[PDB]
Design an enzyme around this catalytic site. Structure first.
Site, PDB file in Angstrom:
ATOM      1  N   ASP A 109      -2.421   5.735   1.221  1.00  0.00           N
ATOM      2  CA  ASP A 109      -3.162   4.968   0.996  1.00  0.00           C
ATOM      3  C   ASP A 109      -3.182   3.909   2.447  1.00  0.00           C
ATOM      4  O   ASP A 109      -4.444   3.613   3.389  1.00  0.00           O
ATOM      5  CB  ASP A 109      -2.752   3.579   0.666  1.00  0.00           C
ATOM      6  CG  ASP A 109      -3.451   3.437  -0.369  1.00  0.00           C
ATOM      7  OD1 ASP A 109      -4.401   4.357  -0.612  1.00  0.00           O
ATOM      8  OD2 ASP A 109      -2.815   3.159  -2.070  1.00  0.00           O
ATOM      9  N   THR A 110      -2.411   4.212   3.311  1.00  0.00           N
ATOM     10  CA  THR A 110      -2.409   3.282   4.641  1.00  0.00           C
ATOM     11  C   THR A 110      -3.563   4.420   5.463  1.00  0.00           C
ATOM     12  O   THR A 110      -3.745   4.036   6.508  1.00  0.00           O
ATOM     13  CB  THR A 110      -1.427   3.042   5.496  1.00  0.00           C
ATOM     14  OG1 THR A 110      -1.348   2.466   6.722  1.00  0.00           O
ATOM     15  CG2 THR A 110      -0.415   4.427   5.814  1.00  0.00           C
ATOM     16  N   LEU A 152       0.550  -0.878   0.109  1.00  0.00           N
ATOM     17  CA  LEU A 152      -0.013   0.294   0.021  1.00  0.00           C
ATOM     18  C   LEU A 152       1.064   0.976   0.114  1.00  0.00           C
ATOM     19  O   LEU A 152       2.007   1.213   0.291  1.00  0.00           O
ATOM     20  CB  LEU A 152      -0.899   0.361   1.322  1.00  0.00           C
ATOM     21  CG  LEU A 152      -2.560  -0.289   1.483  1.00  0.00           C
ATOM     22  CD1 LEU A 152      -2.203  -2.226   0.561  1.00  0.00           C
ATOM     23  CD2 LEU A 152      -2.973  -1.201   2.434  1.00  0.00           C
ATOM     24  N   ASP A 153       0.358   2.587  -0.477  1.00  0.00           N
ATOM     25  CA  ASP A 153       1.323   4.068  -0.324  1.00  0.00           C
ATOM     26  C   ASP A 153       0.800   4.100   0.764  1.00  0.00           C
ATOM     27  O   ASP A 153      -0.098   3.744   1.647  1.00  0.00           O
ATOM     28  CB  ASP A 153       0.280   4.779  -1.224  1.00  0.00           C
ATOM     29  CG  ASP A 153       0.028   3.482  -2.809  1.00  0.00           C
ATOM     30  OD1 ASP A 153       0.757   2.691  -3.491  1.00  0.00           O
ATOM     31  OD2 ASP A 153      -0.587   3.910  -3.838  1.00  0.00           O
ATOM     32  N   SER A 154       2.010   5.556   1.126  1.00  0.00           N
ATOM     33  CA  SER A 154       2.094   5.615   2.187  1.00  0.00           C
ATOM     34  C   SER A 154       0.543   6.493   2.430  1.00  0.00           C
ATOM     35  O   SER A 154       0.132   6.707   3.205  1.00  0.00           O
ATOM     36  CB  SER A 154       3.601   6.867   2.397  1.00  0.00           C
ATOM     37  OG  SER A 154       3.291   7.961   1.059  1.00  0.00           O
TER      38      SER A 154
END
Ligand code: PC1
Ligand code: PC1
Ligand code: 3PE
Ligand code: 3PE
Ligand code: ZMP
Ligand code: LMT
Ligand code: LMT
Lengths: 255, 494, 38, 81, 170, 98, 77, 85, 73, 64, 106, 72
Positions: free
Chosen positions: H44-45, H40-42
């Site tokens: 996204d989390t 997951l992208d930064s």
């Protein structure tokens, strides 16, 4: 008591933004609460229709400026009453679910394997001691206006003839309110309630975009926060009145 | 011998017994305490015997002894329906004062008991003597034993506190002495019956008023002048604080029914607007600064100033209702202030060793019985119906209003501001969060000693608040002789 | 959901909408002003 | 879940979750002492209630069965012809 | 009967408040609820009795404040307006008690809650059944105390403390 | 710094939008727009402009602050917060006479 | 017929209703007393009371209009 | 009595099951990781944990937002909080 | 006297109280303190006294009926 | 002039509609479907209306 | 003396030694500590006080504006004051009392 | 399910009993006992209130007028 049941049924949460659906989960609460909202708005032939709307017509019945003004003023009060009563019944029961998923998970669909015995909490209805009042109070909210409307209103009724409620014969308005008022103003609150209710439902559900344009307009951002903040009355009292007294006490103590 | 001298001699006999038992024994201090407490029970027993035999509508002094052996300074002891209840309050309060401070003295226990037994004599005297020079003698004999009651058994700031009460009370009392001396020289005596006959000229009465009022403003005390009370009623031991507030504060309340109302009526009438202005200010400025007080015992002391102003305005109304309400509020403050010093200076200061309200919070969670009595006491201080304090305020305020309507309306602010300080203190200590984190270990709830002196004091406040006629029946006839006035069709009858 | 709870809620619904039309049928003409009550 | 509480605290209203075993016996006893106090208060009212109008001989008025002023009237009214 | 309407809500409160240890949570709930229930029937009866017969009821018990020209009795007067007020007061009190048997079921302190409920009912009765303005003021203040004691029932919440001071001083 | 601080502004910008749009479906579309704005400036490095993005966005969250942001009932500032707080000390008191 | 002022007070008719057409309030209230004010048991006493009071109102409405035109339709309330 | 471990895991598993940004729903384990195990992208989390906050009706303080980078840590957060519904 | 229970006496709060108890030793006569000391002690009580002087016996509500006047002077 | 931030109200308001594609589409699918479809949503907004209406028509025809 | 800042503005999620009041154990305190705490009058931060007087002024003006239009166009009375025979002067407290309408002006 | 009732009344732990300090003796028998005996005797004390006297005369003055009815 009805809104007490909905708060208990979920998490002791109280916010409208996180309540939705819950009409199927709480069948009795919605009806009884709608029993109440129909009389709160004085829907015809409710316990509120025989009291709330007589004040409006007896206001216009006293043919003075002040009487007419408060008719107009209280009439606006009626229309905004019908408005937030739609807000309560739509958001909590008739809306899309807004709260967490545990409020809603039944046991019909199987979401669990090794913990199916517990961990559902599907917003259950209350027990006997919770429901027996609501049902009794609702039976009042329907029949009580019509059954005592002669004891209190009548036309020449003599219940309060011990001078408990002395009205001076230079003020009485019952005869005028019975005959003088035209049918339009006699009936007007019903039209407004039946008009803005379907409008409010349409804005809250059918056209769910207009209100956000209002909230995120700058003109509406300010009108919204003026009322949510209760006319800023608390802010002014707490800062100008309450905190003035605390600093006066400090000045006397220190200086 | 008269039965009013028996009230005086018993505490004197009790002092003798405390000092001569160790000679019949290294005797325990427990037996010192029992003797002093029994001997204050007997005074209470006698005082109720005097009250059963009282005559509620007699205009002559009662329980008098015919002396007929005149000297220069002779004790004359009479009881009147305007003084009977002050005597009864004294004799009910002094046993609780001893029981309240039963384990807290710990040292110089004989000297402590001998001072309180001495104090009860002198304060009983001040209500019983029939002269205004005799009144002054006992009204100021209480001063040396109170200087020592504070410096021996007082808290940290005890030395300055003992100097403040002594010197302020000495100074203020010496302006009353000059006026008493003038009255005696003009009339020849200070025996009540000869003074009340005599009517002073207006200008003299205007100058006797300046002199009796300087004293009582110093001893009410009014706001500009109360710096001794905020020290003395706090640094003092618990038993000292109960006597100082319940009994000593009332020496000037009862001293206006003797020194001003009957012998200087024209002055009292024409100067009332000055009294009411002073009284209104001390209802406000004292109420404002009772909000911002961080010392719990000091908060209770400041409350007494606001209460005393209401009764001072009542005694200057020239009305039968504000005069009786002033006696009732004097009695009401006696029981209720006593209980709140018992809560502040005698329970929290016993357990925490501090009076700062910053360290207290949520004491309901571990001391439910303290909370119950603390709330009832706090509501009486707030003047809530069903307590004797409410009746005293209602009648005091009514007469203040009927006499000068504007000051009564500013005095009635008390209703709002007494409630604001009382609830705010209660909410901060009992409620207001959880048990405070500065409490490292748990605190026990009330002992059986602490429960029963609070219960006793609270019971007096309620039953007298339901049936005040227990005290009103004695007051009506005797109070009816300090009112000044006439009505046109009722006066000068033929 | 519970049968008793559902029955009570529907019945209380039947409390309205039968009092409504019965009162509207009987006193409706008077309220609107079509006919005086005599 | 029941709150943790200190067990050394004594409270006249029970404190936390307090129900004794013998509560039905204690409750019953309190019921009679209430019912006795109410009975004294009822006999007081019956003998001290004051009405300036008197009830009709035929309409429902159960106070006619316990109040002296009314009962003395109807007893006197039950004497004619 | 009329002076029994006044006394029953008071008596149940005393048992629940200073005797909650002895009767327990259930014992308090029954006595508090049942005592208020009984008062409600007595007042339904009083409505037919006073209003439907035009027979005001007076009772006087003793003096409260007896100074010259000022005599306020611990007295009660039941009239047409009085009995109208009692019916909502006593039914809504009677039903809210029954409602609360389940609403507060998990709360640690039920004997204190149900006591305050009985105490509140007593004070409204006093408010609407007094002879004079000053005994009216006993209930007027009494319900004020009862409101503060119930907006602050969870006295460990600082928000609740602020709102009770606001209820009290306003 | 500028990393944990930024993610705060993101989560904040999501909630402010949720507060003013009650209906979740509409806010969802309203939400993804906020993500795009945070995605248009993924690669700004110089601290001279790094704080200016934070400093200016810190203005819109008050320029659109909800009068009453929703609070979970049991959080700081909720409706059930501190309701039945236990005593923070359950040990019997140490024996002292009074 | 018209009910006299002395007769009107003995039945305790309410004060503001001691008007010219209250001879029918005496049987209305009496009917109401005997029936516990139930709104479907004195249907014709009520109607008779309302109908009579109706007439003296429209009579007031008529000659008020004459008063209004005497002042050229100006404000009179 | 309160929340268990098997209950909390299986709700949060169904939470990520509906999220498109994960590479594959098969590799959802207790010791899973948003950053690399799921990818997951930064950005996204945090949107992920916002779902956890709403599901359990709690509030995640900003100080602890940086402490949630995996399912295990997320589970350890819920169970240590007696506050969750 | 009696030993009290253990209190986490706060060094900060103790010195705050020690500040208040000793506060008066540092009061000075400035232009600011005279202004407050003059308004509270003189102006406000003088203002109250003046109203108390001018309204004395001005009004009586005792037994007064319609046709009579509340004002007594 | 636009701010150094790219945000604008006009684009903010225009996006206030149901998104065509959503990374959370499945996660939020429940609130608008099945038991929570619009028909079931207002299926019981008027509980007794159906039962009463047919019952009342029985009363009306009874008189005639 | 620290700044006079209320502890209502502190973080409700820090590691406060006293979480309820948001205080650490030995922290310095403003001399106004009594009324800066969590149990003290609340600070409302919706708008500046100057702007509020404007907005409450706008509501007042609109309320007056609604009142003004009603005065311009509101009905005349339609019912003549009901005539009572004798004014009921004996049923209202004699001549020393206010009596109803009786053959007077309008 | 309800917990058992508990508490140390007067701080007395369940083992031992309240130790009498000294005050209990005279305060319960002498102090309170004096008030019960005072209350019992106060009932039989004759009423010398000015009102009981003023009522009896003022009734007799009103009785001469039609304001109050005279038995004789
Ligand atoms: C009369 C009924 C009184 C009921 C008292 C209940 C009780 O003892 O509560 C103690 C309770 C505790 O009872 P509890 O059993 O719930 O204990 C709960 C557990 N604690 C508190 C230890 C965490 O103490 C308090 O809450 C303190 C406040 C007492 C309030 C007193 C109520 C009556 C006051 C007089 C009102 C009169 C108004 C007149 C106008
Ligand atoms: C007029 C006579 C004087 C009127 C004021 C009387 C009281 C004086 C100040 C007393 C303050 C005590 C200390 C404050 C403690 C506290 O937190 O109280 C909070 C309360 C107010 O609560 P609050 O507004 O701070 O609470 C905000 C937070 N919530 C909403 C979540 C609870 O203080 C008061 O009640 C002050 C008195 C207000 C009186 C208003 C009525 C009269 C208005 C006349 C115009
Ligand atoms: C005297 C003179 C002054 C007094 C009279 C004028 C007063 C001001 C009139 C203008 C403002 C009226 C409201 C405008 C719309 C608005 O802001 O409504 C907000 C209200 C709450 O909405 P909320 O729950 O926050 O979210 C949407 C849920 N459907 O929205 C709702 O409740 C939704 C349903 C109603 C929406 C339309 C309301 C129209 C009112 C006209
Ligand atoms: C919350 C309230 C709880 C109240 C609990 C106590 C209730 C006591 C009820 C007493 C009833 C007395 C019964 C007899 C009637 C009165 C007889 C009499 O003469 O009593 C004298 C005195 C005043 O009563 P009276 O002068 O008659 O007042 C006029 C209205 N009856 O009346 C007295 O003798 C009163 C002396 C006792 C004081 C009562 C209150 C103490 C507490
Ligand atoms: P990952 O490590 O891959 O990357 C995460 C990010 C890119 C956040 C890093 O932490 C990073 O390097 N940060 C750089 C921060 C930066 O310079 N730009 C990112 C965006 S800051 C900003 O303000 C963007 C615009 C936001 C506009 C929307 C929010 C406010 C809207 C108005 C109020 C709400 C509606 C009414
Ligand atoms: C006008 C004067 C002022 C008026 C006030 C008068 C106050 C009088 C105080 C009481 C008289 C002195 O009180 C006296 O105190 C001393 C203190 O050393 C006591 O003396 C004793 O104290 C302790 C008591 O345990 C012993 O251990 C010690 O060995 C012994 O000296 C006397 O037993 C007591 O009688
Ligand atoms: C609770 C305490 C109550 C008592 C204290 C307050 C009492 C206030 C009483 C005010 C009324 C006294 O008596 C009143 O005097 C004022 C004096 O301006 C008069 O007031 C009038 O004066 C002038 C004529 O001079 C009029 O044109 C004017 O319209 C009006 O102000 C009233 O006609 C009279 O009735």
């Amino acid at each position: 008591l009805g809104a007490g049941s909905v708060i208990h049924a979920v998490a002791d949460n109280q916010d409208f933004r996180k309540f939705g659906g819950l009409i199927s989960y709480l069948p009795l609460t919605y009806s009884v609460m709608l029993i109440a909202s129909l009389s709160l708005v004085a829907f015809p032939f409710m316990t509120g229709f025989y009291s709330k709307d007589f004040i409006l017509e007896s206001a216009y019945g006293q043919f003075s400026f002040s009487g007419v003004a408060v008719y107009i003023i209280a009439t606006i009060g009626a229309i905004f009453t019908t408005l937030y009563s739609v807000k309560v019944l739509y958001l909590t029961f008739l809306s899309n679910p807004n709260g967490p998923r545990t409020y809603y998970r039944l046991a019909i669909d199987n979401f669990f394997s090794a913990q199916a015995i517990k961990s559902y909490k599907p917003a259950h209805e209350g027990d006997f001691f919770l429901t027996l009042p609501l049902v009794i109070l609702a039976l009042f909210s329907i029949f009580f206006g019509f059954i005592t409307k002669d004891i209190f209103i009548g036309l020449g009724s003599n219940f309060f003839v011990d001078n408990s409620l002395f009205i001076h014969p230079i003020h009485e308005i019952m005869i005028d309110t019975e005959f003088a008022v035209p049918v339009l103003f006699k009936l007007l609150p019903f039209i407004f309630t039946i008009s803005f209710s379907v409008i409010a439902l349409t804005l809250s559900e059918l056209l769910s975009e207009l209100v956000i344009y209002f909230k995120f307009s700058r003109f509406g951002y300010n009108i919204f926060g003026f009322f949510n903040q209760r006319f800023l009355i608390e802010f002014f009292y707490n800062k100008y009145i309450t905190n003035l007294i605390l600093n006066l006490g400090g000045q006397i103590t220190k200086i | 011998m008269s039965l009013l001298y028996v009230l005086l001699i018993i505490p004197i006999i009790g002092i003798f017994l405390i000092s001569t038992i160790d000679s019949f024994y290294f005797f325990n201090v427990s037996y010192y305490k029992k003797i002093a407490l029994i001997t204050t029970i007997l005074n209470l027993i006698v005082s109720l015997i005097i009250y059963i035999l009282f005559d509620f509508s007699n205009n002559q002094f009662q329980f008098i002894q015919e002396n007929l052996d005149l000297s220069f300074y002779d004790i004359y002891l009479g009881v009147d329906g305007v003084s009977i209840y002050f005597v009864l309050l004294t004799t009910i309060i002094m046993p609780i004062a001893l029981v309240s401070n039963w384990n807290s003295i710990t040292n110089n226990i004989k000297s402590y008991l001998i001072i309180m037994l001495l104090l009860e004599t002198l304060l009983l005297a001040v209500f019983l003597v029939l002269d205004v020079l005799l009144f002054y003698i006992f009204f100021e004999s209480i001063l040396p034993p109170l200087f020592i009651l504070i410096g021996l058994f007082g808290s940290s700031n005890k030395v300055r506190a003992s100097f403040y009460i002594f010197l302020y009370t000495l100074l203020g009392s010496l302006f009353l002495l000059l006026s008493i001396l003038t009255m005696s020289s003009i009339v020849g005596t200070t025996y009540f019956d000869v003074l009340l006959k005599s009517s002073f000229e207006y200008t003299t009465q205007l100058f006797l008023f300046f002199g009796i009022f300087i004293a009582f403003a110093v001893k009410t005390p009014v706001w500009g002048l109360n710096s001794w009370l905020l020290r003395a009623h706090v640094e003092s031991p618990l038993g000292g604080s109960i006597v100082l507030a319940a009994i000593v504060l009332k020496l000037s309340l009862y001293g206006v029914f003797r020194l001003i109302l009957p012998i200087l009526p024209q002055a009292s009438l024409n100067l009332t607007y000055i009294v009411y202005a002073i009284g209104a200010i001390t209802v406000l400025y004292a109420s404002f600064s009772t909000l911002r007080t961080v010392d719990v015992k000091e908060l209770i002391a400041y409350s007494s100033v606001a209460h005393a102003a209401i009764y001072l305005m009542g005694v200057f109304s020239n009305t039968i209702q504000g005069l009786e309400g002033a006696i009732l509020l004097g009695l009401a403050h006696g029981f209720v202030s006593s209980g709140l010093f018992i809560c502040a200076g005698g329970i929290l200061y016993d357990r925490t060793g501090t009076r700062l309200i910053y360290f207290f919070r949520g004491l309901t969670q571990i001391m439910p019985l303290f909370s119950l009595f603390f709330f009832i006491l706090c509501l009486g201080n707030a003047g809530t119906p069903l307590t004797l304090n409410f009746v005293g305020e209602f009648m005091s305020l009514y007469g203040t209003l009927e006499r000068l309507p504007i000051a009564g309306m500013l005095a009635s602010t008390s209703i709002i501001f007494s409630a604001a300080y009382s609830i705010y203190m209660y909410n901060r200590i009992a409620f207001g969060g959880s048990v405070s984190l500065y409490f490292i270990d748990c605190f026990r709830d009330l002992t059986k000693r602490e429960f029963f002196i609070l219960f006793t004091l609270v019971s007096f406040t309620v039953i007298l608040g339901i049936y005040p006629s227990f005290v009103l029946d004695g007051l009506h006839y005797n109070i009816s002789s300090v009112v000044y006035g006439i009505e046109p069709n009722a006066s000068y009858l033929t | 959901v519970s049968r008793v709870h559902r029955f009570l809620a529907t019945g209380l619904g039947a409390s309205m909408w039968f009092w409504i039309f019965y009162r509207a049928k009987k006193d409706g003409p008077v309220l609107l002003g079509w006919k005086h009550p005599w | 879940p029941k709150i943790p509480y200190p067990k050394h605290v004594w409270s006249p209203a029970g404190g936390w979750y307090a129900q004794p075993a013998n509560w039905k016996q204690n409750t019953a006893i309190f019921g009679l002492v209430i019912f006795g106090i109410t009975a004294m208060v009822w006999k007081y009212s019956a003998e001290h209630e004051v009405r300036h109008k008197m009830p009709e001989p035929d309409r429902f008025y159960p106070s006619r069965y316990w109040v002296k002023q009314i009962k003395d009237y109807e007893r006197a009214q039950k004497e004619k012809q | 009967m009329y002076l029994s309407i006044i006394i029953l809500p008071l008596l149940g409160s005393v048992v629940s408040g200073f005797f909650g240890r002895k009767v327990g949570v259930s014992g308090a709930q029954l006595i508090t609820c049942s005592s208020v229930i009984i008062t409600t029937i007595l007042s339904i009866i009083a409505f037919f009795e006073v209003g439907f017969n035009n027979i005001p009821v007076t009772i006087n018990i003793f003096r409260w404040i007896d100074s010259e020209w000022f005599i306020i009795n611990w007295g009660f007067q039941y009239d047409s307006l009085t009995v109208s007020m009692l019916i909502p007061v006593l039914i809504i009190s009677s039903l809210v008690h029954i409602y609360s048997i389940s609403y507060m079921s998990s709360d640690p302190h039920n004997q204190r809650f149900f006591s305050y409920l009985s105490l509140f009912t007593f004070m409204m009765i006093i408010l609407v059944t007094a002879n004079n303005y000053l005994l009216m003021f006993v209930g007027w203040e009494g319900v004020g105390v009862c409101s503060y004691l119930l907006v602050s029932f969870w006295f460990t919440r600082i928000a609740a403390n602020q709102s009770s001071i606001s209820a009290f001083l306003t | 710094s500028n990393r944990q601080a930024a993610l705060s502004l993101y989560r904040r910008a999501l909630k402010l939008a949720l507060d003013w749009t009650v209906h979740r479906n509409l806010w969802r579309g309203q939400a993804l727009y906020i993500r795009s704005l945070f995605e248009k400036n993924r690669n700004v490095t110089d601290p001279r402009l790094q704080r200016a993005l934070l400093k200016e966005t810190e203005k819109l969250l008050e320029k659109w602050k909800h009068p009453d942001p929703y609070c979970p009932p049991t959080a700081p500032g909720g409706s059930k917060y501190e309701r039945n707080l236990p005593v923070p000390n359950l040990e019997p008191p140490p024996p002292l006479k009074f | 017929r018209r009910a006299t002022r002395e007769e009107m007070r003995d039945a305790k008719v309410p004060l503001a209703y001691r008007d010219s057409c209250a001879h029918l309030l005496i049987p209305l209230n009496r009917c109401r007393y005997e029936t516990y004010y139930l709104p479907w048991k004195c249907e014709d006493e009520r109607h008779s009371y309302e109908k009579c009071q109706y007439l003296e109102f429209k009579k007031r409405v008529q000659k008020m209009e004459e008063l209004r035109e005497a002042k050229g339709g100006a404000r009179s309330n | 009595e309160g929340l268990q471990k098997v209950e909390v895991y299986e709700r949060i598993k169904s939470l990520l099951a509906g999220f498109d940004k994960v590479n594959d729903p098969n590799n959802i384990t207790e010791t899973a990781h948003f950053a690399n195990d799921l990818g997951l992208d930064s950005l996204d989390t945090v949107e992920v944990v916002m779902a956890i906050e709403e599901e359990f009706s709690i509030e995640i303080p900003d100080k602890d937002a940086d402490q949630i980078h995996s399912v295990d840590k997320a589970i350890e957060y819920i169970l240590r909080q007696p506050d969750a519904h | 006297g009696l030993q009290h229970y253990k209190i986490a006496m706060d060094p900060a709060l103790v010195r705050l109280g020690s500040m208040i108890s000793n506060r008066y030793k540092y009061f000075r006569w400035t232009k600011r303190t005279a202004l407050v000391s003059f308004m509270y002690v003189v102006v406000v009580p003088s203002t109250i006294g003046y109203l108390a002087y001018k309204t004395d016996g001005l009004w009586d509500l005792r037994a007064k009926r319609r046709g009579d006047l509340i004002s007594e002077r | 002039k636009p701010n150094i931030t790219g945000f604008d109200m006009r684009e903010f308001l225009r996006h206030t509609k149901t998104p065509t594609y959503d990374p959370w589409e499945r996660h939020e699918a429940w609130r608008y479907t099945g038991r929570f479809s619009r028909f079931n949503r207002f299926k019981g907004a008027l509980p007794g209306f159906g039962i009463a209406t047919v019952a009342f028509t029985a009363y009306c025809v009874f008189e005639h | 003396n620290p700044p006079r800042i209320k502890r209502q503005f502190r973080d409700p999620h820090a590691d406060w030694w006293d979480k309820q009041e948001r205080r650490n154990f030995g922290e310095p305190v403003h001399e106004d500590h009594d009324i800066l705490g969590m149990f003290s009058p609340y600070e409302y931060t919706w708008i500046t006080p100057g702007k509020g007087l404007f907005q409450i002024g706008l509501f007042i003006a609109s309320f007056l504006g609604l009142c003004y239009v009603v005065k311009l166009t509101y009905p005349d009375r339609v019912s003549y004051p009901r005539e009572f025979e004798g004014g009921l002067e004996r049923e209202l407290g004699g001549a020393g009392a206010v009596r109803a309408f009786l053959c007077l002006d309008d | 399910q309800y917990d058992p009732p508990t508490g140390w009344l007067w701080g007395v732990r369940p083992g031992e009993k309240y130790q009498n300090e000294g005050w209990e003796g005279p305060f319960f028998y002498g102090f309170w006992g004096s008030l019960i005996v005072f209350a019992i005797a106060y009932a039989y004390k004759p009423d010398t209130s000015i009102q009981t006297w003023a009522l009896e005369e003022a009734r007799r003055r009103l009785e001469a007028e039609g304001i109050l009815e005279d038995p004789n």
